[PDB]
Structure formats: structure tokens, C-alpha cells
Amino acid sequence: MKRVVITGMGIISSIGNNVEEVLASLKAGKSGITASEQFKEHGLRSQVWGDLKINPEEHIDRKQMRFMGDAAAYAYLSLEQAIADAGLTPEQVSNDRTGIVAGSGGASSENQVIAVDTQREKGVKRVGPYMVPRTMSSTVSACLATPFKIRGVNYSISSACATSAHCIGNAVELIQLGKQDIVFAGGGEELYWSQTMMFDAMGALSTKYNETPEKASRTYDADRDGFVISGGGGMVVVEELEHALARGAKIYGEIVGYGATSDGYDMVAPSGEGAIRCMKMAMQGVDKIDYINTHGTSTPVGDVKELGAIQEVFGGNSPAISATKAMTGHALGAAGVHEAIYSTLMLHHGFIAPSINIDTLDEAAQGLDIVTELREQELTTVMSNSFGFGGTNATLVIKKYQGL
Amino acid sequence: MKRVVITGMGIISSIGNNVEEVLASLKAGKSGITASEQFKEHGLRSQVWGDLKINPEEHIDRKQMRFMGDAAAYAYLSLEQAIADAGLTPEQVSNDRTGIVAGSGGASSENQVIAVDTQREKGVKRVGPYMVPRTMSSTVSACLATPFKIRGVNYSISSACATSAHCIGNAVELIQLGKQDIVFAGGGEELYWSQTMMFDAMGALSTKYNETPEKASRTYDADRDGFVISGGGGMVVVEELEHALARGAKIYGEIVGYGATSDGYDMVAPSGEGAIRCMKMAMQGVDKIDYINTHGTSTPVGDVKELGAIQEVFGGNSPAISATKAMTGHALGAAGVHEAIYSTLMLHHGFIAPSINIDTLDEAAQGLDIVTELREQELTTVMSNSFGFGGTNATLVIKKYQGL
Structure with a gap:
């Protein structure tokens, strides 16, 4: 293919x-x-x-x-x-x-x-x-x-x-x-x-x-x-x-x-279960994820369902996670491509952008690596999640191209 | 495939x-x-x-x-x-x-x-x-x-x-x-x-x-x-x-x-050239198109460009043509699926629906088979064209399934 x-x-x-x-x-x-x-x-x-x-x-x-x-x-x-x-x-x-x-x-x-x-x-x-x-x-x-x-x-x-x-x-x-x-x-x-x-x-x-x-x-x-x-x-x-x-x-x-799935559940709130399927589909045949740019919109329910999904997919010693929306806000129809770009710039320039404004970290983030300070390092593989009203889910996974 | x-x-x-x-x-x-x-x-x-x-x-x-x-x-x-x-x-x-x-x-x-x-x-x-x-x-x-x-x-x-x-x-x-x-x-x-x-x-x-x-x-x-x-x-x-x-x-x-192409020409008027490519891309090896349900919206320019495209694709050997929009009007976002359904019914039931309200046929249609009365016959293959603002073209080709 x-x-x-x-x-x-x-x-x-x-x-x-x-x-x-x-x-x-x-x-x-x-x-x-x-x-x-x-x-x-x-x-x-x-x-x-x-x-x-x-x-x-x-x-x-x-x-x-x-x-x-x-x-x-x-x-x-x-x-x-x-x-x-x-x-x-x-x-x-x-x-x-x-x-x-x-x-x-x-x-x-x-x-x-x-x-x-x-x-x-x-x-x-x-x-x-x-x-x-x-x-x-x-x-x-x-x-x-x-x-x-x-x-x-x-x-x-x-x-x-x-x-x-x-x-x-x-x-x-x-x-x-x-x-x-x-x-x-x-x-x-x-x-x-x-x-x-x-x-x-x-x-x-x-x-x-x-x-x-x-x-x-x-x-x-x-x-x-x-x-x-x-x-x-x-x-x-x-x-x-x-x-x-x-x-x-x-x-x-x-x-x-590339994962695309549907919750089949609620018009406005994510199920969690659809996101699990979406991430897994995007990870088929992928060795290891270094960083996840989360959908992470700053909503009470939404933020938690996505973290639960990530924990279920990855189990322990999760990838590094940040939500760039804390900096940018939610660009709606442009959010998917903005965050693919952000994630690709992280991949290409070798850093992880911080998840800002966290004064008290939600308990749902326990046992996850939420990045809150700029972290400079080589990344090989990144993942970006986008979940929309109507229960619609997309995940993209982007890997360094290294001549092989 | x-x-x-x-x-x-x-x-x-x-x-x-x-x-x-x-x-x-x-x-x-x-x-x-x-x-x-x-x-x-x-x-x-x-x-x-x-x-x-x-x-x-x-x-x-x-x-x-x-x-x-x-x-x-x-x-x-x-x-x-x-x-x-x-x-x-x-x-x-x-x-x-x-x-x-x-x-x-x-x-x-x-x-x-x-x-x-x-x-x-x-x-x-x-x-x-x-x-x-x-x-x-x-x-x-x-x-x-x-x-x-x-x-x-x-x-x-x-x-x-x-x-x-x-x-x-x-x-x-x-x-x-x-x-x-x-x-x-x-x-x-x-x-x-x-x-x-x-x-x-x-x-x-x-x-x-x-x-x-x-x-x-x-x-x-x-x-x-x-x-x-x-x-x-x-x-x-x-x-x-x-x-x-x-x-x-x-x-x-x-x-x-299934053909999908773009004119790259004008925001509102079709080029003709894009529709040629679109029709051909949809003609995935078919023996003969029997009938074309045209985009045919009842506009002065649009009707003519599509007929010229059909002439360029088929030369002298044109299929039967009708525009169901003369009966239905233009259903915009629903037009493509409506006309796929109309064309499929024609295929399945063995008839061609008339292109109504033609009192004086445009000179661009001379030497094409514009169907103006109900025609009952076996069809094997039908084609439906949809062309939108922004120069965007879609064609579907549907063939009878008879056990092979």
C-alpha cells in the first residue's frame, strides 16, 4: 500500500x-x-x-x-x-x-x-x-x-x-x-x-x-x-x-x-468508548507513541472521558500528553489541522509544548504524564485526537520519516 | 478490489x-x-x-x-x-x-x-x-x-x-x-x-x-x-x-x-473540461453507457457546457439523455442522491423518464438523443452527473447486477 x-x-x-x-x-x-x-x-x-x-x-x-x-x-x-x-x-x-x-x-x-x-x-x-x-x-x-x-x-x-x-x-x-x-x-x-x-x-x-x-x-x-x-x-x-x-x-x-469512528451515544457528550476504538485503529501496526496532543477543550466531562480512553488504550507509562487548546482556544473546523501542524512542528523541531494553566490537576489525570513545562527532546511518533459533536472521532498518527 | x-x-x-x-x-x-x-x-x-x-x-x-x-x-x-x-x-x-x-x-x-x-x-x-x-x-x-x-x-x-x-x-x-x-x-x-x-x-x-x-x-x-x-x-x-x-x-x-474532479476555472459557471475528465474517470471499463441523467438545472450556460462535454466524451455515439430536474427542481445538497435513486429506479424497472417542458430544443442538443417521452426498455448501465459551484464535479455509474 x-x-x-x-x-x-x-x-x-x-x-x-x-x-x-x-x-x-x-x-x-x-x-x-x-x-x-x-x-x-x-x-x-x-x-x-x-x-x-x-x-x-x-x-x-x-x-x-x-x-x-x-x-x-x-x-x-x-x-x-x-x-x-x-x-x-x-x-x-x-x-x-x-x-x-x-x-x-x-x-x-x-x-x-x-x-x-x-x-x-x-x-x-x-x-x-x-x-x-x-x-x-x-x-x-x-x-x-x-x-x-x-x-x-x-x-x-x-x-x-x-x-x-x-x-x-x-x-x-x-x-x-x-x-x-x-x-x-x-x-x-x-x-x-x-x-x-x-x-x-x-x-x-x-x-x-x-x-x-x-x-x-x-x-x-x-x-x-x-x-x-x-x-x-x-x-x-x-x-x-x-x-x-x-x-x-x-x-x-x-x-x-488514521482512525475514524462514531460513539453512537450522545449528541454533545463523548462516550469514551468511541475514542478508544479510534485511537486503536490509528495505532494498528504502530510500534510506540511518544506524545499525544489531546482534543482537550477545557470542558468538565470531555477532558475526563478522553483521559480515561487514553489510560485504557495505553495502560501504564503512557505517552507524554499536552492540550495545546489551553494556549490557543478551540479553532472548531480548523482545530484538527492546527493540532496536526502543532504536533508535526513538535515532531520536526524536537520539543513538547506545555499544557498551560493547570493550577490543580484533575484526579482523572492520575498516572498520566501531563506535560506542564517545555520539554526538549527527539520525538519519533506523535498522535493527535479530535472529537466532535454528534459523537464523531478522528485520530492521526505521524511518524518521522528516516529513509526507511 | x-x-x-x-x-x-x-x-x-x-x-x-x-x-x-x-x-x-x-x-x-x-x-x-x-x-x-x-x-x-x-x-x-x-x-x-x-x-x-x-x-x-x-x-x-x-x-x-x-x-x-x-x-x-x-x-x-x-x-x-x-x-x-x-x-x-x-x-x-x-x-x-x-x-x-x-x-x-x-x-x-x-x-x-x-x-x-x-x-x-x-x-x-x-x-x-x-x-x-x-x-x-x-x-x-x-x-x-x-x-x-x-x-x-x-x-x-x-x-x-x-x-x-x-x-x-x-x-x-x-x-x-x-x-x-x-x-x-x-x-x-x-x-x-x-x-x-x-x-x-x-x-x-x-x-x-x-x-x-x-x-x-x-x-x-x-x-x-x-x-x-x-x-x-x-x-x-x-x-x-x-x-x-x-x-x-x-x-x-x-x-x-465514481468520478470526482475540479474545473479550476470559474466559481459559478462550469468549464466543460472538468466534466469530461469526471465522466471518463467514472467510466471504469464499462461496455456502454445506456442512459445519462444530466446535472441539467435549466440554466442558459450550464445546460450547454454539459452537452458539449457529453459530445467530447462519447463522440457521435451518445447515450439517451434526460434531465429529471425539469420535473423535480434542484434539490441542492440532496440532488446527487435523489438522482442516483431516480437513475437506479430507471435501471431496475427498465424505463427512461422524460425530459419535460421542451417546447423548443436548444441548438446545442442537435444530434443528441434527448428523451422527451417515457421510454420503456432494458438498461444495463446508467450515469448520473452532478456539478457544483466552485467547479466541483461528481459522476456515478451504476450497472445492473445479474449474478456475475
Whole structure:
């Protein structure tokens, strides 16, 4: 069966506008979380966010930007970064054997609001002709495929917080089936009050730390109280191994494992049992995991179910564990690819990022190695978990490529 | 490589609430299009729709319905039908080797409107806790996976008008990779003024036939003027052939071909060139395509590009062609699965449904066999095309299974 590698990466996240900024933040344990004036103005109880410190409309031509909400815009910038990082020629980017699988958890709640307000006040003719590509569920794939002249597969996968992890897993599968040699995979998520409001309405967000935003996201801490919403974009170049080697590609790592399962249990709370199956499926034929980047959103139930699953899968002398969401917040549709990137940077640069803001460690973490300080060491294999509403689970396992 | 068959079908469309009704409508060339008072009351120029003549709240319990917009609800009812058609008990339905791949072009524009209106008037605390599963891009997969206790793969694919065709294709791929034995595949779409309005704003919808709704959708007619919007749900049970045979399953057909390509050209208009590649990729060695169910939305440019592609693929030896959208309207995220089902019924029952409302045939169709009256005959192989915004193309090819 064909082997699959990561050959390029691009990112916009709360902790950096490109890989070099992200890498610096990960090593420092620097929070990307700030107070949100927007959320406060709209009367939301959660008033913190992992905001993106970039204005995409400054970096993209009107001809492309007219079709995009921020999810597509962040992903577009990420794809530009990844293509440059990969050293791909134009003939490789626009090629029958080169595709895109990239999605969003939402799409553009902001443009829905704008279009509806505009139509009610000013009439359908003043809405303009660009709202369908901004708001449709395939916005991220559609808005990138067209200007990058993608000729291979082109669609979005959605699965709430697992979205961009399944995008990467599907890419791997396309390559293993022999259908594509390269697939650009990832996702994007806009950050706007109207989407956030729906999570606030269900009680999912942190509300007790608005006065101290950098302390609000605190995975595994006894006083955690929900997630901090974020967004952004991420793209990785997923490529068949021989194709990568023949062109002298940079190889960050090999995707040696992909798990996708379903709990069949509750719409909002994880079962634990589905995650066990998902991890095990991703670990089939994998010798040893050095580090796990957990889904770890800073929720009371969620954090515990995942730790129980990890303990059951690994037993004693577990891998090192950290939740980068304590720094970044929850990037929703972009979380899977952000955390694959974070994990791959850890793999490539030889460090583990700290799990920050743990003042009192939950008892469910007993007998696990929760990393709370930067740890510099060679890693051979990493694992990243993503679990979404609807009981949907994705796990990716990435190993160093070492000439064998 | 593993062979894949269709063993169950379920559908809610403008031309029927189940397969028996839909079959009758196809044979009669019966329009599912009516006047929309809702669209008129909101000041839209297009005032016709392929509405769904069903009350989902009559048929779904509050416990499931609370999480659903109409896209999930129509898909849920379709899944119930397909499961019965396939003869499956809760044991095969809830199984590690049984999954779901099902999506929507939008998600729930309606619930976005409701949540925002409620929040502005009454505050976030009165919005209630169910809005994220209703509105998120994975609503269809998530709202079905939980109550049916799905344990295998669980995600949504999105690609605008191609959405549910890629869902089917991906299911086939999961089976070919050996990951699943059964995958429930399909899609859903709500029909609501706020979504429709965004298409009306870009000039895509039929506006000249509001007085005579059954004449508005008229693919290949010289006086066509845009599509008629619709929605609904569809699901198929996609199953590994040996698994189907071992349990004595009724088999409707074998999926012998799946194409997925991208134009890389224009966000809204098809290139023609992508569709050529897509058709050919789906023609996995087949002797002869007998019939093509075209994407055929009743637009001036779209109808012509597809015909030119068909001419490029087949030369002088064209299959019989019809556009069922002239009867049904354009079901968006549900169009792919609806038309796979229509095409499979034609294959299974031995007929070709007419392409209705052609008073003056476009000059681009000269020397093609456009079917305008019910044609009763044995078919061996059928093809269904779905092309979406963002230049995304899917084709499915389905062949009769007769013991070889």
C-alpha cells in the first residue's frame, strides 16, 4: 500500500500568522487568548476569544475575496504558505493528480446575518451576487479550488471539531487508493459573535475568567468551565511518498495511522468508548507513541472521558500528553489541522509544548504524564485526537520519516 | 478490489415521499413544482419551488427532532426508509463496520435566522441549547448517527450541488479500502426563504414562469431562465457485494464508477473540461453507457457546457439523455442522491423518464438523443452527473447486477 507524507504546512491561528510565529508561541507556552469587545457588545456571557491577529482582506485580491468569508480567507492564506513551504511547481499545484479536501465546522454565520439584514432593510437586489459561495458548507474547498486552479478532487468534509482531521485522513485514503498524488488538506473557521452565541446559548463556553482572559482556557485544571472559542486556517500538503522523494521534497513526517469512528451515544457528550476504538485503529501496526496532543477543550466531562480512553488504550507509562487548546482556544473546523501542524512542528523541531494553566490537576489525570513545562527532546511518533459533536472521532498518527 | 452494491433506498423529494411515489412520478413525467407563497411574501423574484409534501414532526419524535433542521429531518426519514428497504435490524445498523457519510449544501439558514432574531430581542439565555447541531455543516451526519447508534465512520461531505454524489462516492471508497461493510450515504436540504434569497440575489433562479409553476423548470428548452429550487432528503445503503450476497440481500445495482474532479476555472459557471475528465474517470471499463441523467438545472450556460462535454466524451455515439430536474427542481445538497435513486429506479424497472417542458430544443442538443417521452426498455448501465459551484464535479455509474 502507498505511503503518505506531509511535505508543506501553512497556518493562521491565535498563536501565529505563519509557522515561524506559531513555533515561537508553542515553545514559550504563550496564550493566544484575549478579551473580546465584540462579544461584550452583543451581550454574550463568554467574553474571551483566540482571535486571529491578521486582516485577510489586506492580503487577498478582491477577485478572490469577493467570494469568501473569513473561513475561506484564512484557509487561502494557509494554502499559499503551504505551497511555498513545499516547494511545489505551478504544474504540480494545477494537475489532474492534485486535489483539495478542506472544510469548516460552520461556514459563514457572519455573511448569513449580513445578507438577511440587508435583504430585510434594502431588498434582494442589494444583497449582491456573492453570498452563496460565502455561506455554503463547501466554502473553504470551493473558494480555494478555483483560484489555485485545482483539477483533482475538490470537496469539503465537515464533522464539527473533527472537521479538518477527517479532511487529512480522507486525503491519506485518496492517496492510498491511487486516486491522487497530492492532496491539499485542512480547514478554516471564522470567528464572529453569531456563531459564538449559539455555543454560549448551550453553556459550552468559558464565562468565569473574562477579567483574566489568558487563564480561561485551562484543560485538565479542576476549575475549568468550558472552552474558549477561536478560529483561523490551516493547510497541509499530503503527498505520496515516492512522488515526494523523486522531487526532493521536504518531509516533515509520515502519516502512519488514521482512525475514524462514531460513539453512537450522545449528541454533545463523548462516550469514551468511541475514542478508544479510534485511537486503536490509528495505532494498528504502530510500534510506540511518544506524545499525544489531546482534543482537550477545557470542558468538565470531555477532558475526563478522553483521559480515561487514553489510560485504557495505553495502560501504564503512557505517552507524554499536552492540550495545546489551553494556549490557543478551540479553532472548531480548523482545530484538527492546527493540532496536526502543532504536533508535526513538535515532531520536526524536537520539543513538547506545555499544557498551560493547570493550577490543580484533575484526579482523572492520575498516572498520566501531563506535560506542564517545555520539554526538549527527539520525538519519533506523535498522535493527535479530535472529537466532535454528534459523537464523531478522528485520530492521526505521524511518524518521522528516516529513509526507511 | 471489492465490489459495491446498492441494497436499500429512501427518499423525500418534490415528486414523492418514498420510492413508490417517486417511481410513479418519474414514469408519468409529473412535475413536483408549485407556487411558493413564502417566497412571494419575502419579496423574492422567483416564486416557485419543488416543495416537500410532508410533515416531518408527525414522523420524528421530539427527542430526535430537537437537534434537527429540515435537512437532517428529511435525511432521517430517508434513512428509516432505506434501512427498511435493505431489511436491516438495529444489530447491522449499529455495528463497528457500519457507517454514515451524508451532508448538505447549506445546513440550516432558517435556524440561524431564528437564533439571531431571538438573541437580539430576548437575549442569549432565551436562545436555548439546540442551535449548534441544527446549524453546523455536519448536521445531517450528526443528527442521524446519534439516534441510529452508528459506530463506524460518521461525517458529512459538502460540495454544493455535488454534495450527496460525493457522499456516495466516498462510501464506495470506504468499502473498497476494507474499512466498512455498509455505509449509509446521502444528503438533505432544507427549503427556506433565506437560503433561496441568496440564489435569487445572484440571478440563478427562474422568475418568468411564476404564473405557471410546472413550466418553470425546462432544461434544454430555448426559453429556460434559471433553476427552480428544491430540497429534501435521500439515502442509499451502500454495501460490500459478498456481504450483500451472504445475507441474501436484494441488489438494485452495482456502483461500478465514481468520478470526482475540479474545473479550476470559474466559481459559478462550469468549464466543460472538468466534466469530461469526471465522466471518463467514472467510466471504469464499462461496455456502454445506456442512459445519462444530466446535472441539467435549466440554466442558459450550464445546460450547454454539459452537452458539449457529453459530445467530447462519447463522440457521435451518445447515450439517451434526460434531465429529471425539469420535473423535480434542484434539490441542492440532496440532488446527487435523489438522482442516483431516480437513475437506479430507471435501471431496475427498465424505463427512461422524460425530459419535460421542451417546447423548443436548444441548438446545442442537435444530434443528441434527448428523451422527451417515457421510454420503456432494458438498461444495463446508467450515469448520473452532478456539478457544483466552485467547479466541483461528481459522476456515478451504476450497472445492473445479474449474478456475475
